[model samples]
Each structure stands twice: as structure tokens, then as C-alpha cells.
Target: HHMDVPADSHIKYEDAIDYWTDVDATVDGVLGGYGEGTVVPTMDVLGSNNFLRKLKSRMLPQENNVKYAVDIGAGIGRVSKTMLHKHAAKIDLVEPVKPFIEQMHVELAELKDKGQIGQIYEVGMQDWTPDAGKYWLIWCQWCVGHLPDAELVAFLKRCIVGLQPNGTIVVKENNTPTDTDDFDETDSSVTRSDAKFRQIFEEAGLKLIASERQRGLPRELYPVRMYALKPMPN
Candidate 1:
């Protein structure tokens, strides 16, 4: 049931890695099963970039450039190449799949050569710890589902320390309208309800500063949402 934390037993870490490792290192492959592949990819990134811009204006009003940022679940560096590359001076990537990480080297070669690309870690979100106070931005998208609810909460707690004084942590994930999460056996991930996401944020001691549901994607697919956050005051 959606009321319960996603059963850890139902989510297989190795199997999920296997599923993604088997996927081709391409835009369509990372976002497979969702039709309008080309259409949605552009829209997805556009929406995200805009969301980030609004958050920056609201949270860090004086900032125009991000000194350093990390993109978690950086499948082929799609968002990093398209969006983060525009704003962040150094963009680190956290991706578990070797194929996709290897592909990111080729795909984001220009940024690497320009020295805008930072550490490229082959680590999963549930285990990867961000270096404390090193990042002006931490971006998570399309990947947190690989983590169970408790891990997700714990993960963010670590992320809170990783942020710079004026830094922000942002998540853009798919959502459901139902009260409970929708589990996908193919990838062993859960599409959480919005309420559940809010609950998780609170559990992590994160204060939500900004949030919005994304638009311009197909009505049939799960709705996408973006959140901007900082740690709660002592």
C-alpha cells in the first residue's frame, strides 16, 4: 500500500542496475517506454532549467553563476550537458551505469576539455555522499526512485551538509496523483505520490523553499515536479 514506506524487499538494487546497464547510452534509451521521446526530452530540460532559474532568483537573488554543481543520475550527462553546462562552472556527475558514464565522456567531451566538468563518479545515489560544503547546487532527477523511502531520507540528510552557505538542493522527479506510490517492476523503482514526497522532505529535515508541477508533457504520462530546498534551522 502507498501508506507504507516502499517495501525494501520489492526493490532490487542489483536488478535495477542491470536493467539500466542493459539500456543503450542514448536519450531515448534513458527515457524509454515514454513515447514522444524527442518531444519530451526537450520539454523536460526546458522546464527544469526554467525551474532552476526561478529558484535562483528567489533564493540567491544576487547570484548569476553557480560555482560548482553535481548532477545525480546523470544519464549520459543529458541534463548536465544541456542545462547545467549553461550555468555551473564545474559540473560533477553521479551515475552508476558504466555504459552511460562512458557515454558521458564522449557526450560531454567539450565541457571536460574546457575544464567545466568535475568529478565523474560511478556511484549510486543511495551510497554516494556529497562532499560537505563543496557544492553551490545539487541536482537530482529521474533517479531517486532507485532508493527506498528511508534511504531517500538519509541520502538527503547527507546532501544538506554538502551545500554551500548559499547553495540549494533541487529534485525533479515523476509523481502520481494517487495516495500511494506506483511500483514499476521493470526498473524496480517507485513513482511516489506528491504527498509522500513532501513527507519524505520533512523526514529529511529539509525546508521546501520552492516547488511546482511541470507542464508541457503528455497528459498520459506521470506528472513531473520540481522542488528547491535548504536544511531546517536549528
Candidate 2:
């Protein structure tokens, strides 16, 4: 809901532009948006490449131009700068927030000027156009959990329409605590059970290719559960 820690919560990365609704709330306090909407104990936040490596082994083996990679919920282009920069010929950074998109453009423009990245798109994940003609590597992380149930299901359905025959979609999020008692609709939550995710995937005409528990330093709260998915080649 709010990015700045009103009191009890921890800091989020600067790249997580959606951490708090208003930025002015935390100018004097601890930097709230510094490490991906949740506090990482050390300054060394986990790299996106850790997840990318697993995705590459499982999905990107048969590579082509790989020119068009889609980065969903691509906050401040941090993941783009770290992992997607090398192989992405042209990347569409899918994020709906205007401020975040502006920040990403600033970062990406500099990267382009420096010849580090090719091209970047500042669009929402659900809005980015997809085609069946070209191959793509889509990273839709940290976004789905925020969606309402109907919207999340719609997102899964949309992925099929967005991918080529062999394209891939890498998804990572907090494992939804199963106990209904744990469900709190009041807060923006990412808690979906593994079985629930499987249902979302299955209904979307996708099959899970790989999965892992996100092992990061000082993993107390917000330990991620990762899932890599691909369109079922018909």
C-alpha cells in the first residue's frame, strides 16, 4: 500500500518504485525503498542472475537472436541492468507505474548511450504486445502476487497469447501460506500456495519447467518461491 515504513516494516530497494505510494513519508527515516520491497539484511541484495541462471539452463538452451525479451514488473530496471542486459537484443520493461517507468527510462537511456543495453520499453506487463513469430524470454516476477485472484488468473491466460511456440515465462513470488487463517486481503500480499499456482499454470496451458526455493541471505520474511514456465508446444 504505502512504500515508506510507517513504523514496523523494513526497507525496500530503490528499484522497487512501488514500495510505497508516497515517497515524502520516509525522507527523514530509514530508507524504505532500497532492496526490493522487503529488507535484505546486508547491502548485498540477491542478484536476478541467480534466478536467470536456473531459467537459462532449463529454457534458453536453444537460443536464437533472443532479441525480444519481456520483463514484467521490471522495477527500476535493476533486473534488466543485472541479468537481462547481456542477452536481451531488445527488452520491453513491463511496469505500469509512471514514476518507476520514468526512472527506468533514465537508467536505460544511460545504458544505451554507454552501449550496455539495446532498447527498453516502459509499458505495463499485461499491456506489452506479444507475437507468435519471434521467440521470447519473459520474466514476470514480483507482480502476480499483487494481482487479485481474477486478475491473476487472467494474467495466466494472457501469457499463452503472449508467447511463441517455445517461448518461456519465468515467475517468482512469495509462497502463499496455505492456512486460510493467514490470508489477509487488507495488505497487498503475494501469498499463493504451490497447488494454487499449479492450478493457475495448468489452466493457462503452461507447464512448470523448473522450480526452486529462493535462498537469500537473512531470509526471514519474504523468502521467495520461484517457478519457471513455458508454453506447451502444440
Candidate 3:
């Protein structure tokens, strides 16, 4: 027998994330067209550095006190920079690129020295660790699409393992092509489909509480999407 009333949904840390980001679109444009045939000016605000700050506000919530965050594929600390600017929290940034990790260190020298930002590890998602009791939120925006087959399976499991009972894990990623929207060059790894994502969430004992508006992004590159995830009771 089912209850007449709908169940009350509870999404932990991913409650107040900012999904549609002009800053993300802008940066993607600059990087995509950089040093190529495209002729966009570097002075364009899209190329400006302040866009990250706008992206940062969405990472940490005002009402809730988020003390720890893990940033995967933290390219040049674009998101981490905002985390520091907007909130007072310890962030563990994971980057696969060695040079980018070094650059992140230089940019966060003050925080690193003062022990504000926790650590920078030159490792991919497969090599990263999720803090069971500490990490309250995760910055996985535009990152998960790169994981391969075996890694994808392992990642979802590790994410669940690392999160505390009430902690939430946010995943902003691309989904498989649908009827009207077909897959193209711009789409990332296709080892898993949208149905697979839901399965993975359910299998991991995480709940799909709420999702932000899924709008066409970059306005140029192949279509993209962003969504959130949270842990469920054991």
C-alpha cells in the first residue's frame, strides 16, 4: 500500500547550487576558440577573471555553513578560487594535470600557507579520496563527463563511501543523447546513459531530490547539461 501523500524529499549539500552559469559559458568559449581560427578578443569579459567569482557564489550557500569541499578536475582553480573568495572553508582540490596543480598552488599560496585550503593532489578522479566525515559538498561541475567506463563505476561507489550519512554529493555532468537531441562530437564519455545515471544513483543508495533547469549551454558547442546528486539512507 502506498501513502496518499508524496514523500518529503531531502537533498543535503546540493540544495542551493547555481547551475546555469554565464561564467561557465564564457570560459568555455574562450578556451574552445583560444589560439584557433576563432577571432574573439582576449579583453572580452568572457576572457576576464572575475567570472569565477560569480560562479563561486553558487558553490557555498549563505545560510548553511559548509566547512569542506572537494573540487575534481580543478582546472586552474577556476571554481576553487571562488570557494575561497565567497566562503570560509577548507577545500581539497584534485587535479590530474601536474602543471595546473602547480599553478593552483601558486595562486593559492596564501591559503595553502595558512592552511585554509587543505591540499592539492595531482591525481585523477580514480585516484581521489572522499572525506567520509569532513566533506559537506563537492564541486563536480563539468568534470564527470571525462571518466571512462571502469572509472565511472568506481567513482560513483567511492563518492558514496566518502560521504557522511547526511552529506550530499553534487554532480554536474552531460547525459546520453535523447530522441530530439542526438549525440555528437561535443558529448563526452558515453559509457553510461541517462537511465544509467539514475540507476547508478539508486544503486549507490543516493536519492534524486531536485534538479536545476537544464538549458542549452555554450550556445555554440554541442549541447550540455548540469545536475545534482545526494546520498540516501543505508
Give Cα-based local distance difference scores for all models. 0.86, 0.58, 0.53
Ranking by lDDT: 1, 2, 3
* Model 3 RMSD in angstroms: 11.3
- Model 3, residue 102: what's the lDDT? 58
- Residue 123 lDDT in model 1? 91
**Predicted structure 3: lDDT:** 0.53
Q: Rank the candidates by TM-score, best first.
A: 1, 2, 3
Residue 81 in candidate 1, Cα distance off native in Å: 0.7
What TM-score fits each model?
Answer: 0.92, 0.71, 0.63
Clashing pairs in 1: none
Error of 1 at 83 (Å): 0.7
Query: Which candidate ranks first by TM-score, i.e. highest?
Result: 1
Show where candidate 3 strays beyond 4 Å: 1-31, 34-66, 83-88, 176-193, 214-216
Leading candidate by lDDT: 1
Off by over 4 Å in 2: 1-47, 60-64, 114-129, 177-189
Q: Please estimate how well model 2 matches the true structure, expressed as its whole-model Cα lDDT.
A: 0.58
User: What value does the lDDT take at residue 156 in candidate 2?
Assistant: 65
